[PDB]
Amino acid sequence: MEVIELNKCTSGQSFEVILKPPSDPSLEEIQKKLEAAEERRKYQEAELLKHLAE
Amino acid sequence: MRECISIHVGQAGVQIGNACWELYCLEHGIQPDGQMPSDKTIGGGDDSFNTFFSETGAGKHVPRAVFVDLEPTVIDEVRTGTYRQLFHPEQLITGKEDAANNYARGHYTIGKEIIDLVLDRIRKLADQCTGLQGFLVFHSFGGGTGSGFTSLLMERLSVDYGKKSKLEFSIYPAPQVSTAVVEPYNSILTTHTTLEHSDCAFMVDNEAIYDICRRNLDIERPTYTNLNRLISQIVSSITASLRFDGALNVDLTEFQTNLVPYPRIHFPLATYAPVISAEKAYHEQLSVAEITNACFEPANQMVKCDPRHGKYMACCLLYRGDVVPKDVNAAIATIKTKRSIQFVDWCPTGFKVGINYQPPTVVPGGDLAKVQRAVCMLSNTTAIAEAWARLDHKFDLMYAKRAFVHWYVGEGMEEGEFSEAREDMAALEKDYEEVGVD
Amino acid sequence: REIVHIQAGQCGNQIGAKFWEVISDEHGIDPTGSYHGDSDLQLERINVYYNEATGNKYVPRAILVDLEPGTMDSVRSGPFGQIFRPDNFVFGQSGAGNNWAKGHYTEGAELVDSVLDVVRKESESCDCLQGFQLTHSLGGGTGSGMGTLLISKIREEYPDRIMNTFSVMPSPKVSDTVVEPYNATLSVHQLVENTDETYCIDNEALYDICFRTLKLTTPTYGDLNHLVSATMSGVTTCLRFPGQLNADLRKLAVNMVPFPRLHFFMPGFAPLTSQYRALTVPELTQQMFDSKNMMAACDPRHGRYLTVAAIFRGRMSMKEVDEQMLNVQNKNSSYFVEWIPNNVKTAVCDIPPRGLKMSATFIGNSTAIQELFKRISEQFTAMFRRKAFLHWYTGEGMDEMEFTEAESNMNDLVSEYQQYQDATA
Amino acid sequence: MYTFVVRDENSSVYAEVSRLLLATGQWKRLRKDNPRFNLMLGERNRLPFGRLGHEPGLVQLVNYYRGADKLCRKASLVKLIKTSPELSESCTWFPESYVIYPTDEREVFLAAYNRRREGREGNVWIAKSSAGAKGEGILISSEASELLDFIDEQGQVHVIQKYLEKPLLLEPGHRKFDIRSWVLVDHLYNIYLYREGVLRTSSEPYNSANFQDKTCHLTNHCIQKEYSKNYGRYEEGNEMFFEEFNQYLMDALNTTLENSILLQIKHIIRSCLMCIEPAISTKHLHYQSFQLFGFDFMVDEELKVWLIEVNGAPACAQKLYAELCQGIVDVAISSVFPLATSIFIKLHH
Ligand SMILES: Nc1nc2c(ncn2[C@@H]2O[C@H](COP(=O)(O)OP(=O)(O)OP(=O)(O)O)[C@@H](O)[C@H]2O)c(=O)[nH]1
Ligand SMILES: O=C(Cc1ccc(-c2ccc(OCCN3CCOCC3)cc2)cn1)NCc1ccccc1
Ligand SMILES: Nc1ncnc2c1ncn2[C@@H]1O[C@H](COP(=O)(O)OP(=O)(O)CP(=O)(O)O)[C@@H](O)[C@H]1O
Ligand SMILES: Nc1nc2c(ncn2[C@@H]2O[C@H](COP(=O)(O)OP(=O)(O)O)[C@@H](O)[C@H]2O)c(=O)[nH]1
Ligand SMILES: [Ca+2]
Ligand SMILES: [Ca+2]
Ligand SMILES: [Ca+2]
Ligand SMILES: [Ca+2]
Ligand SMILES: [Mg+2]
Ligand SMILES: [Mg+2]
Ligand SMILES: [Mg+2]
């Protein structure tokens, strides 16, 4: 049980106590999947208004 | 000095953020007007509190914060609250209609029409920063904005600020504070697409906060105001090292270094003590030993789980108030002989301790009693995976019948994202078990 | 977030009228549009249902539709008749003769464009249009045939807006003509496809309640309408009043509709009114869940709840509310599907309905509603197997195939509810 | 009323607890996967402890202690006894044992074996593991490489432990036995020892010479029901209960059962359960646990009691199922969910 890295200031102090030793998608890829979902939405909307047109 | 930008997303994120900044002003002595009498360098400075506050030539200290919600009801109260003139209009960003507790609606449909403007308002703040550290992102798991928009924002922040750190404060869904039945869906979906973009995430289960407020504050049915003021106490103790002089966790990167040996397992468990009701006139003040021992009672954790049946990989102790290093090590020595505290074999069994002498600040008239010393423990234990198991089980029950799925598909999401996000959580669950059980 | 209200036909206009009477009293608006209330939670969300006009007058966002002028002349002379915007009265003179085909295909077609003109004018003045609600019966010709035509046209022009209905289902015990099973079956198919939420108000249940519970030997349509306006006000409480619940029509639809076609709800209300004994929370929650209090003549014990919403009104200990709701769940946990965790939600609003210090409105999405659709389908088939009374419809241009398809779709919905009532975890 | 679920339908004991609870009129059974229960009669493996105590408005109780496996699986039993100061490498009532893998002590085993080598007195041991099902996989040898051969012959870790060569043998018969004591630990960690134990007998005469025949040496109930021809002659089912055994100890050795044996059993039960109490207690937890244990003891000719193993999912003697399962309801269940003398000995601590 040893203390380490004792730093002290006026606001407080810090230290470590050891008890025992041991033993991304690009912007274009984002915008495409965003627009791929938007197209799926408008396909769904087109099929609806076709159905309603029928 | 290096600056930190806070981003509050959705109702939960915004209301928690307003509770945190309220507390920050009380702690740093900033009035609702933005003026700070004790700040002697007018209109500038490199002090540690300026990591969270910029300064105007007129002496106003302005949060480095962005609020964003897809409906204006919540942010409008920020615009008309006690701290109304703390912020500028451009920091508050409103939509017209919200994500209706639909991840897909917040991520895909409504997200796309707002993400560019949010990033542009984030950019205005980052341009007023000499060296920017990264971001602290507040949000709910269950809201459609909190889950769907957050994950899109986090994706784009990794692209626009690839070398800056990103920390989350995430509200885990609890049915007792009114809950949409689809919050398990949104939680998993947002965790999956945010995981590789978040360096450290502090989960707060509303169930734990709710029961603490009932047990220790004797509030029979807590409100969001009761929950958020307690939450901000914890948040403040976690961020106090960023806003005050010190040597532990002075950098957002220190959080990952000190608490996250493996990137995917970046969900430290927070435990806080003491929580004492302000209606108790005199309360026998608890010692260093008694509040430190309370950090190992599940009843004080932000997430209900049993650390005894898992393994530790890191543990930080953040004290506020009258505390001396020797009291701490005396309290740790005794606690170790009495508690089941097993670390992973490939990690040192120890504690990183941080003490700030200023005791906790409490909102005048709030529910929390002033205390002479408090502690927040941040421990990365595999036991938190219990919370992933609960959420994943409910996800599984609803999804087996595809209940409510049509709401997400109808916004342009495909069913495959459901099982893709779920398989990611299945990997995360066994990541935890390989690390923590023999 | 504004809502546009539409009432079509005799039943739709008689029920809609009483709805505007009730809530206009709750929000403190007098029969001339002047607000004379005493609490400003009265007006925090008054824009949801009222347009603010000159001299701070409030005029309902209501469109009144019928194919004959009779009932709408009674509305205009009724108690709150002059509250309504005069240009929103849209009527013909021929009538619909209790004939779905006349309201949907011939007589209603001639008038529908005029209605949509008024709808568009109302929507154009909404800062954020939230959706539409429609009051109508399914057993007549205007509310049923033209009402579903309007819903189809509204969805074409506002495809991304929520459309809800309060739909009165016919019952042989309260019946005007023999063809009501035909008109209801054809209407249900329309609703399955084109509404987000439909509150099924069964005239059978409204009668039984009036007779067996409310002690009225000879129930009139006015007596059954009292219960409907009281339920409608309760169902819309959470949207009309500043509360902790921050939810629009879409959010509530999201939280109650697990499958698109299964959006037909069983409404309920407690206490049943026609008195001074204050009701205790435990009594409110038990009555609320009693089948004798549900306005759809279905036994909830014959099915399983997919979702449940409960809205309490008045000042009450919400701790005992949560206590009582959690206890009804746990004492009867088998009737709530286990593959939708935590599917019972609760809301509270401090302002009670006029005349009662406490009330509770029950909204249930139960698979037991299939009993209603089975009932209608049996009556439909009894005549259709002999093609009885079909000449009234073929003479308006319809073909027998359209009836066969409508019956098949309703028997499909029946089988859908039965699938999820047997489903397990 | 109260609600409960049953997720281990192979459990003789809680099948009877389940049926008695329903016969109370104030307990209702639900389907295994309904989460709105007050009590869980859980599965014995992969019990989802992490989903308990999160149902608003329901106090939840389960019939298993998360973490109790450390005591009821032989490999961890040995490791716990050796490494915990409360029990200590220097522990008198637990036989010399070593865990061997096919954290391994394969040769500190041989060191003690090569010490009994030196003084050339009884060097008999027995290898076994938790994978063995009613008497398969055991094997008793006198020389150590035949056992270690048998060790890696298969792929689950085993324990080597001193075979007690001079057991107390009942007469007439020259017969070995073991004692089973049933212990109930309730939600407050009271330790209740059931007043009624059983002695699982060997009806074969103990023979110190040949260890190959696996019947006069191995105690277990099915082995004697299956591969003993003379079984049941002395008592029914090779099961002697406490009154008979007490009377025998008085007539034969001028002593009592409590004085010569039970005092040591109660000491072993308490020290084992109190050792792990900090690790498994549910006193400040969001759900609570009780559990019934089966302690297996052996007695040597000096009337010294030895712990052999602890069983976390024990069966019971048929004659006492009724009394014991009723005691579970009173002490462990109704303790927490009340209705509208004592058969247990409370071991205070
Ligand atoms: N602790 C806490 N939780 C909140 C608060 N507000 C909402 N929640 C929780 O968050 C969930 C609801 O998500 P919201 O944040 O309200 O939704 P949102 O992010 O605004 O997104 P939308 O669905 O578009 O409205 C529930 O689980 C609530 O328990 C809050 O102020 N404090
Ligand atoms: O839905 C209805 C009838 C109704 C009202 C209210 C509820 C309801 C109450 C509480 C709930 O739990 C809270 C979920 N939290 C929201 C905030 O985020 C956190 C999660 C969920 C649902 C359901 N159903 N709408 C009226 C209406 C109908 C027809 C025509 C006009 C208006
Ligand atoms: N160290 C030892 N010395 C002498 N005999 C022993 C012994 N270990 C076991 N025996 C004999 O072996 C028998 C039990 O072996 P084991 O411990 O493998 O039981 P089990 O766990 O296989 C059956 P259950 O757990 O279902 O009750 C003992 O009762 C005893 O008669
Ligand atoms: N509850 C209720 N039901 C009505 C009312 N008027 C008619 N009905 C029912 O609806 C049918 C008559 O339909 P109606 O609305 O009069 O036809 P429409 O005017 O052509 O739409 C019958 O089944 C009645 O049971 C009313 O005022 N209240
Ligand atoms: Ca300064
Ligand atoms: Ca990154
Ligand atoms: Ca004409
Ligand atoms: Ca036109
Ligand atoms: Mg919102
Ligand atoms: Mg009529
Ligand atoms: Mg065993």
All domains of chain C in start order, with CATH: 1-258 (3.40.50.1440), 259-368 (3.30.1330.20), 369-425 (1.10.287.600)
Sequence-distant (≥ 6) Cβ neighbours of residue B203 within 8 angstroms? B170, B172, B267, B269, B302, B303, B384, B387
Distance CA D104, CA D79 (A): 10
| Strand C89-91 to C62-66 pairing | parallel
Q: Please, are residues B384 and B302 in contact by the beta-carbon 8 Å criterion?
A: no
Give residue numbers after which chain C breaks (C–N above 2.5 Å).
274
Please tell me what DSSP assigns to residue B84.
G
Distance from CA of B147 to the nearest CA of A (A): 16
Q: How far apart are CA C134 and CA C137, in angstroms?
A: 10
**Cβ separation of B397 and C248 shorter than 8 Å?**
no
* Nearest protein Cα to ligand 3, atom 12: D218
CB C384 within 8 A of CB C185: no
Fill in the DSSP letter of residue C172.
Answer: T
Distance of CA D99 to the CA centre of its chain: 19
Residue C194, CA atoms < 13 Å, CB-side half-sphere: 26
Nearest-10 Cα torsion for B396, B397, B400, B401: -150
Q: Which residues contact B247 (CB under 8 A, 6 or more apart)?
A: A5, A7, A9, A13, A14, B354
Dihedral sign computed on CA atoms, order B425, B426, B429, B435 = negative
D neighbours by CB contacts (3+ pairs under 8 Å) = B, C
**C300 in Cβ contact with C334 (< 8 Å):** no
B179, C342: Cβ pair inside 8 Å? Answer: yes
What atom of ligand 1 comes closest to residue B173's alpha carbon? 27
| Ligand 3 close to Cβ of residue D164 (< 6 A) | yes
Chain B residues with a Cβ under 8 Å from any Cβ in chain A: 104, 108-109, 111-112, 152, 155-156, 158-159, 162, 196-197, 244-248, 325, 328-329, 332-333, 336, 343, 345-358, 410-414
Annotated binding site of B: 11, 71, 140, 144-145, 179, 206, 228
| DSSP three-state, residue B408 | helix
Residue C38 main-chain phi, psi, to 5 deg: -140, 0
CB atoms within 10 A of CB D184: 21
> Which of C108, C91, C19, C103 minimizes the C-alpha distance to C61?
C19
- Within 13 Å, how many C-alpha atoms sit on residue B324's CB side? 3
Report whether C15 contacts C21 (CB < 8 A).
no
Which residue owns the Cα nearest ligand 3 atom 7?
D163
Scanning the structure block, which residue is given the tokens 């999947």? A33
Distance CA(B331)–CA(B341), nearest Å, equals 14
Name which of B75, B118, B76, B69 is nearest B98 in CA terms.
B69
Count other C-beta atoms under 10 Å from residue C422's C-beta.
8
B104 contacts in chain A (CB < 8 Å)? 37
- Tell if the CB–CB gap between C425 and B398 is shorter than 8 Å: no
Please give the domain boundaries of chain B with CATH numbers for all domains.
1-268 (3.40.50.1440), 269-383 (3.30.1330.20), 384-438 (1.10.287.600)
Task: Report the residue count for chain C.
Answer: 425
The CA-based dihedral angle spanning residues B173, B176, B178, B180, taken in that order and rounded to the nearest 10 degrees: 50
Look up residue C331 and give its two tokens: 């004492």
- State the CB neighbour count (10 A cutoff) for residue C238: 23
B401·C339 Cβ contact <8 A: yes
Cα–Cα distance measured from residue B413 to residue B418, given in angstroms and rounded to the nearest whole number: 9
* Nearest-ligand number for the alpha carbon of B194: 6
Question: Which candidate, C163, C195, C416, places its Cα nearest to that of C306?
Answer: C416
Distance of CA D155 to the CA centre of its chain: 24
Residues paired with residue B37 on neighbouring β-strands, in sequence order? none
Question: Contacts of residue B338 in chain D, CB cutoff 8 Å?
Answer: 278
Contact across the interface for D56 and C326, Cβ inside 8 Å: yes
Q: What is the edge-to-edge ordering of all strands in the sheet holding C197-202?
A: C89-91, C62-66, C2-8, C129-137, C162-169, C197-202, C264-270, C359-366, C305-313, C344-349
Ligand 4 neighbours (beta carbon < 6 A): C 9-11, 14-15, 96, 98, 137, 139-144, 168, 170, 174-176, 180, 203, 206, 221, 224-225, 228
Contact B298 D284 (CB under 8 A): yes
CA-based nearest residue to D201, from D222, D227, D177: D177
How open is the CA angle B401-B404-B406, to the nearest 5 degrees? 100
User: What sign has the CA pseudo-torsion C385, C386, C392, C398?
Assistant: positive
Question: Is D205 part of the contact surface with chain B (CB cutoff 8 Å)?
Answer: no
Burial class (CB in 10 A: 0-12, 13-18, 19+), C7: buried
- CA–CA distance from A34 to each of B119, B155, B196, B385, C350 (Å)? 16, 12, 19, 31, 43
Cα angle C162-C168-C171, degrees, rounded to a multiple of 5: 150
CA distance B433 to B437: 6
For residue B271, list its beta bridge partners.
B301, B377
CA distances to A34, B161, D71, D262, D348 from D92, rounded to whole Å, are 70, 65, 17, 16, 21
Token pair belonging to C50: 């009222």
Whether B73 sits inside 8 A of C246 (CB atoms) is yes
Ligand closest to the CA atom of residue D306: 3
Q: Choose, out of B306, B386, B390, B401, the residue to mutate when testing the contact with D (most D CBs < 10 Å).
A: B306
Phi and psi at D279, nearest 5°, equal -90, -20
CATH code 3.30.470.20 region(s) in chain D: 68-71+168-347
Using an 8 Å CB-CB cutoff, list chain A residues near B405: none
* Of C221, C235, C242, the residue nearest C265 (C-alpha): C235
Please list the residues that pair with D98 across neighbouring strands.
D160
Asked if CATH classification 3.10.20.30 holds for the domain at D2-62, the reply, yes or no, is: no
**How many whole angstroms separate alpha carbon C101 and alpha carbon C88?**
24
Closest CA to B11 of B94, B90, B114, B118: B94
Match 């394969």 to its residue by tokens: D106
Place of tokens 């069964």: C202
Q: Using CB atoms within 10 Å of the CB of residue C127, give its burial: 0 to 12 exposed, 13 to 18 middle, 19+ buried.
A: exposed
Interval between CA C75 and ligand 10 midpoint (Å): 15
Interface of B with C (CB under 8 A): 11, 71, 73-74, 96-98, 100-102, 175-176, 178-182, 184, 220-221, 223-224, 394, 397-398, 400-401, 403-404, 406-407
> 3-state SS of B240-263?
HHHHCCCCCCCCHHHHHHHHCCCC
Q: How far apart are CA B105 and CA B151, in angstroms?
A: 12
Cis, peptide link before residue B184, omega less than 30° from 0:
no
Note whether D280 contacts B308, CB cutoff 8 Å.
yes
Whole-angstrom Cα distance, residue D289 to residue B180? Answer: 31
Q: C with B: 3 or more CB pairs under 8 Å?
A: yes
Contact (CB, 8 A) for B17 and B6: yes
- Looking at the DSSP bridge assignments, the partners of residue C52 are C58
Instruction: Please give the structure tokens belonging to residue C59.
Output: 């005029």
* CB of B16 closer than 6 angstroms to any ligand 1 atom: yes
- Whole-number Å distance, alpha carbon D178 to ligand 9 midpoint, is 67
Could you tell me the CA-to-CA distances from C372 to C133, C225, C334, C413, C414 in Å, in that order? 22, 20, 22, 11, 9
Residue B240 φ/ψ, nearest 5 degrees = -60, -35
Say how far apart CA B233 and CA B360 lie, in whole Å. 8
Q: Is B134 helix (H, G, I), strand (E, B) or coil?
A: strand
State the best of D285, D287, D288, D289 to mutate against chain B, taking most chain B CBs within 10 Å: D285
Residues lining ligand 10 (ion), CB within 5 A? C 10
Residue C287 assigned as binding residue: no
Q: Do B298 and D285 touch (CB under 8 A)?
A: yes
What sign has the CA pseudo-torsion D105, D111, D112, D117? positive
Kindly list the distances between the CA atom of residue C330 and the CA atoms of C268, C306, C324, C333, D81, in Å, as whole numbers in the listed order. Answer: 20, 16, 10, 5, 44
Give Cα A12 distance to the centre of its chain. 33
Q: Which residues pair with C307 in a beta bridge?
A: C365
H or E stretch at B207: helix B206-217
Strand, helix or coil for residue B87: coil
The backbone torsions φ and ψ at residue C315, rounded to the nearest 5 degrees and listed phi first, read -90, 120
- Written as six digits, the tokens of C349 are 């609003």
Residues B106/B144, Cβ–Cβ less than 8 Å = yes
Q: Are strands C359-366 and C305-313 parallel, antiparallel or unpaired?
A: antiparallel
Nearest to D164 by CA among D306, D59, D38, D309: D306
Region of B238 on the Ramachandran plot (φ > 0 left; ψ -120 to 50 alpha; else beta): alpha
Cross-chain CB nearest to B397 (options C253, C341, C345): C341
Cβ contact A–D (≥3 pairs, < 8 Å)? no
Contacts of D46 (CB under 8 A, 6+ apart): none
Is cis: bond before C219, omega within 30 of 0? no
Nearest protein Cα to ligand 4, atom 26: C11
Residue with tokens 């390989």: B434
Amino acid (1-letter code) at residue B165: S
Query: Which residues of chain A from 15 to 34 reach within 8 Å of chain B, CB to CB?
Result: 15-27, 30, 34
Q: A45: nearest CA in chain C?
A: C159
Determine the Cα–Cα distance for residues D124 and D96; give it in Å rounded to an integer. 11
Beta bridge partners of C3: C131
Q: Is the CB of B227 under 6 A from ligand 1?
A: yes
Q: Taking the CB of residue D187, how many other CB atoms lie within 10 A of it?
A: 21
Q: Which residue has the tokens 């966790």?
A: B249
Residue C381 phi/psi, 5° resolution? -65, -30
Task: Tell me the three state secondary structure of residue C295.
Answer: coil
Min distance B267 CA to chain D CA atoms (Å): 17
Query: Which amino acid is it at A3?
Result: V
Helix (H) or strand (E) holding C25: helix C9-26
- Tokens representing A53? 């047109």
Q: Which residue has the tokens 């002089």?
A: B245
| Domain boundaries for CATH 3.40.50.11480 within chain D | 2-62
How far apart CA C185 and CA C376 sit, in angstroms, is: 7
Please state, in angstroms and rounded to a whole number, the distance separating the CA atoms of residues D98 and D108: 8
Find, among B229, B54, B202, B42, the residue nearest to B138 by Cα.
B202
Nearby residues of D80 by Cβ (< 8 Å), 6 or more positions away:
D70, D71, D87, D275, D276
In chain B, residues with a C-beta closer than 8 Å to the C-beta of D99 are: none
Backbone angles phi, psi at D180, to 5 degrees: -115, 125
Interface probe for D, chosen from C285, C321, C330 (most Cβ of D below 10 Å), is: C330
Contact indicator for B102, C254 with CB cutoff of 8 Å: yes
- The 3-state secondary structure of chain D, one letter per residue: CEEEEECCCCCHHHHHHHHHHHCCCCEEECCCCCCCCCEEECCCCCCCHHHCCCCCCCCCEECCCCCCHHHHCHHHHHHHHHHCCCCCCCCCCCCCEEEECCCCCHHHHHHHHHHHHHHCCCCCEEEECCCCCCCCCCEEECCHHHHHHHHHCCCCCEEEEECCCCECCECCCCECEEEEEEEEECCCCCEEEECCCEEEECCCCCCCCCCCCCCCCCCCHHHHHHHCCCCCCCCHHHEEEHHHHHHHHHHHHCCCHHHHHHHHHHHHHHHHHHHCHHHHCCCCCCCEECEEEEEEEEEECCCCEEEEEEECCCCCCHHHHHHHHHHHHHHHHCCCCCCCCCCEEEECC
What number of other Cβ atoms are within 10 A of residue B377's Cβ? 24
What CATH number should be reported for the domain whose range is D68-71+168-347?
Answer: 3.30.470.20
Residues of B assigned a catalytic role: 254
D34 and C338 within 8 Å at the Cβ level: the answer is yes
B407 is written with which tokens? 């709401």
Query: Are D183 and D205 a contacting pair, CB within 8 Å?
Result: no
The token duo for C251 is 């959010």
List the residue whose alpha carbon is closest to atom 14 of ligand 4. Answer: C140
